[PDB]
Amino acid sequence: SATFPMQCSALRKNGFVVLKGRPCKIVEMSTSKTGKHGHAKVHLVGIDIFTGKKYEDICPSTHNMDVPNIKRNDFQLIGIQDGYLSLLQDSGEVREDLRLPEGDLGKEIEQKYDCGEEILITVLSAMTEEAAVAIKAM
Template sequence: DVVEVSTSKTGKHGHAKCHFVAIDIFTGKKLEDIVPSSHNCDVPHVNRTEYQLIDISEDGFVSLLTDNGNTKDDLKLPTDETLLGQIKDGFAEGKDLVVSVMSAMGEEQINALKDISAT
């Protein structure tokens, strides 16, 4: 997520510049970049997909049900302690859980949880 953009005026060494400050959506780390204002910037395409949680393996991988009925077994549990606890607790209680998976630039990560159990 881009959290700040500032520009500098044209100086004696050429073009005006744009200073970007962003937070990595996967790690939470702060990133900065300075680019000439006349240049283009690549913007990652971020997808969010929801999957029903079927199982959690002992080695920390999840088994997810896709829309077309296949399983997706290549994702690890999230590292965020709060979300991790909510997923493990909800699964242990037998709740029907749907996880939201964010994907960008070849990376995927579970970033949200929804309980769809009938109340």
Template structure:
């Protein structure tokens, strides 16, 4: 019999859950083209001759920033990603751009890279100036990325 690990507590939960299209809201999350997206626009058409009102969704990919659109009958289900945000203390930025982040319990997380955008440039500049930063990491559908930072004024 294989040894089980119960420390995570997620019970192998799915990365998504179904939700009726009519109950989705702007600024919420939805899966479009198998990508986790934030809903930025939403409109509902009137019931047509076939009996379904249609919901037009426009979403921005959480990790690439690409725009996605979809139309779905309001009574049908769409998949919604489980999105988590967690803060980590920035310990070090390596020469190759990889990050060393510390969790609240003292464990090191070393599997993320600094973003290749304005946010990443700001983080590197502030780190090189000796500022203490807390980075916010967003996780959804087996992807994670640094999405923001705060200054620690201690």
């Protein structure tokens, strides 16, 4: 698990790929060949699905690239413990290991939490990292 290999030619322009060690969403994928009769080589460039930094690489087609296994899950927010989100699965389980995200999203979580709204939190687990990435409120 964690990552599965896939021939570079088969990479979707809408999918993900591991670039320079980080899981990235592919934002551009262009093909070129050296000669007129040369074989194809792909120029990938993607955004780190967590940090947001741009990583790019050029590798020939037919060569295998590592594709990260991406999971995204919805927990309902039931607590904020000293900065650790207390999240409730629909199966009844509560996970208090994930921290609160920095930036305006953590500000939205604290504001909507002190206000008492039922807040749904989407956490993104990629390879070895997990992070809260989305908020849905009704």
